[model samples]
Target: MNPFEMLRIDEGLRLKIYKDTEGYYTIGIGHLLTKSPSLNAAKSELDKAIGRNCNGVITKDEAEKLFNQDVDAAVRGILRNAKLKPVYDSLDAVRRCALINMVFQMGETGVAGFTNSLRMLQQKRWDEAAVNLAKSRWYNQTPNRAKRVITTFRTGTWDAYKNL
Candidate 1:
């Protein structure tokens, strides 16, 4: 799977600029997979616990850690899948990256909510995808970012969002 898709994340990472904070924290891309900084390390331990010799049950903390790690692995797994590369090529870097992040946070079932939207993309209906994107609940949740991303998709204009 593509590396981008591998960074599985769960819920949206609600960012807040707290006044009490000291230095800057480069908030990694927003998503559920980013809940804890130690998620990667956590996964290894869980896998070891459920080794071939074990019965498979683990503590709550261990399970939660594994779940997050699995999410990351799943994200990576999907992103790396060869079949998605060609389809991803149709989108600009920003839109592609944004969509990946979205799908990662909302899994296939959740992202599938945009079946009509995906169809528009397959048909090269840029405007329709743009329109569909803005109409979703997600658009309102992350207004400014979504607005910018949808603009590119709708206009078939990739220049502005290429860097992302």
Candidate 2:
């Protein structure tokens, strides 16, 4: 399967830095920013390529490959989280994407703590799933994002609560 294709389908191209699911500064298909020297050096090169003060840019193909790499790492993490597999596999594509997004933000174990939410989702109780999602430490850390994901879980519609 083309990993890039799945990435493109999951994360729309954004050649520049954009806030990821957890509010981190991300670029090139969800590459997160950090103070590490490697990333800084990459950013330096990116700055040179674009212009001083400019974020960065990459070809669509480049971004696709980058996404493939990023998603590969995320998938490895998710797969290693065997406890989440049963419910995770049971989810529909939209809900699955939301779970993947969460897993990307919060590692598998971090997400695994939400037993109630996962249980509700497994039972197909959408509204209860949203409630369980909102009543958590993750929600306290990022309310707006929590609302968005909760709504998506409840309604199976992406961006359903992005306005919050």
Candidate 3:
């Protein structure tokens, strides 16, 4: 498996269009079809992914392929966050992967909103950073995954989220 994919937790796979918590028409591996470019543009990719004029019924193989692209877009999205380059650069691979896992869970913009927590990370304040992550709705909403991700951040080790 790809290292990035290895570090991430389940975002689940769905074969049809459904609304996410933010209420976007999401599909595949949490792929938000209603996101950027154009709605038609997004759905065109959906067509390309499923090889059909999609009415949203997707296949596991198709969603898996598209999921790789989704992670790619997420990587680019996080890379585009110029403000975080220093913090990103300073981390060891495990922490970095864990960071991406979090970014992938919430969009880059969403993770970027962890203003104080990120600064805490930059300062190498592992405890406070994890504490900061805990003090958020993301943690409350998905405590299980959040705990594993936060532990990875704290320990800088993939061991915390082993086989998650």
Candidate 4:
């Protein structure tokens, strides 16, 4: 399962095991495959990835409902916070979605690395936006992708991706 469908933050955290978009049964909740002394110990290590609260472990039924709701809310928050409500004036859908995904994983601090790009974009400074975007932490992470996005913005073809 993708990070969005897993590692949900609910009142009481729970691990929800389910099939993902790519067709695989997986457990959501940031559980990592790590080393341990024995098979049981390894499993216990995995189990430790599940967060604990005094309310006790969640039942399967409760986990399903809570996980679904939290994911939905998180996705909605991504859309809303990114100002993707109005397609015409918003970032391209794929780019916005990618940014939201980054924010979902790295939080606001990570997203703030685009401050220069954001300011240039807000000012409609195409050259400045492209330059700033290419120099940010995001660019270092995906140079080619950033170049394409910049090209799309400069050529005005990015709007088509608004709703996806």
TM-score of each: 0.45, 0.65, 0.73, 0.38
The whole-model C-alpha lDDT of candidate 1 against the native structure comes to 0.49
* TM-score order of candidates, top first: 3, 2, 1, 4
Q: Write the per-residue lDDT of candidate 4 for residues 63-142, one digit (tens) a residue.
A: 55544554565556655655333321455434354444444445555655565666555555768676666776666776
> Which regions of candidate 2 are displaced past 4 Å?
1-26, 32-57, 159-164
Q: Per-residue CA lDDT of candidate 2, range 1-164, in tens?
A: 23343344444458875565555556765566543446456577656544466545666665665666676777676666776877777788777767876776677888888887788898899986777777788889877656666776788765553332
Question: Root-mean-square deviation of each candidate, in angstroms?
Answer: 10.9, 6.3, 3.7, 10.5
C-alpha lDDT of residue 147 in model 3? 86
The list of candidate 3 runs beyond 4 A from truth reads 1-9, 35-45, 52-55
Off by over 4 Å in 1: 1-27, 30-76, 79-95, 155-164
Top candidate by TM-score: 3
lDDT of 1 at 118: 71
Better of 1 and 2 by TM-score: 2
Clashing pairs in 4: 93-161
- Residue 59 lDDT, candidate 3, scale 0-100: 76
On residues 1-164, what C-alpha lDDT tens digit does candidate 3 reach at each position?
A: 34434533457667777767766767877777765535556567678766888765687777777787876776676677875666777677778777777777776778778889888888889998888889899988988878888888899876664655
lDDT of 4: 0.46
Which tens-of-lDDT digit does each residue in 1-164 have in candidate 1?
A: 22222232223222221111222221223312222345343334334543422222344333344445555665565567454444465665545655555565566556656767876775788876777788898887767556755665666444433454
